Amino acid sequence: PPEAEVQIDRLITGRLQSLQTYVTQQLIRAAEIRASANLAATKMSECVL
Amino acid sequence: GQSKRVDFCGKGYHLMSFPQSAPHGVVFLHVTYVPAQEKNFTTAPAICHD
Ligand SMILES: *[C@@H]1O[C@H](CO)[C@@H](O)[C@H](O)[C@H]1NC(C)=O
């Protein structure tokens, strides 16, 4: 256990960094998708209705 | 101005709008015209005179 908490620390840091990167990219992509959905709603109101 | 965009500034035919300040934002009061009390009639594309 004394020497197993240093490699596990590296694994934790790497996996946390991967998760944070995924969440950030997904947030940006979700912002883009929200803009596209707002455009779709505007087209539905202005043109279909 | 008065907008012809559908549902851009309220449900109905837009008449006018009033802005109000609010904490960290704006509040639009959209005054719009809504038809009501419909009645059914017989219609025709055109009327044939002589
Ligand atoms: C007649 O008009 C009423 C509203 O006044 C409407 O609900 C109804 O469908 C109409 N009747 C018909 C189309 O037979």
Side-chain angles (χ1 to χ4, degrees):
Chain A
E3 192 96 10
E5 298 180 10
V6 53
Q7 333 279 344
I8 285 182
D9 263 344
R10 310 196 55 97
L11 281 187
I12 285 177
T13 302
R15 277 153 193 198
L16 205 32
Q17 193 173 351
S18 312
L19 261 182
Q20 252 154 37
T21 293
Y22 167 80
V23 171
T24 298
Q25 311 281 287
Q26 198 86 344
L27 276 165
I28 307 176
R29 199 164 9 239
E32 186 188 4
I33 291 282
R34 191 216 309 123
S36 186
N38 283 341
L39 180 69
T42 300
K43 298 212 187 219
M44 180 95 48
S45 317
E46 250 92 299
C47 299
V48 181
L49 263 60
Chain B
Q2 203 198 356
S3 82
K4 312 272 132 50
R5 303 173 59 181
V6 188
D7 294 343
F8 182 59
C9 269
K11 171 139 202 292
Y13 303 120
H14 187 234
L15 284 177
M16 47 188 319
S17 286
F18 301 120
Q20 305 276 273
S21 82
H24 285 164
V26 67
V27 173
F28 290 105
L29 318 173
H30 299 301
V31 197
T32 62
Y33 168 106
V34 172
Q37 307 194 7
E38 343 152 15
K39 213 197 160 313
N40 317 309
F41 312 89
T42 308
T43 190
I47 280 198
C48 175
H49 205 24
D50 57 274

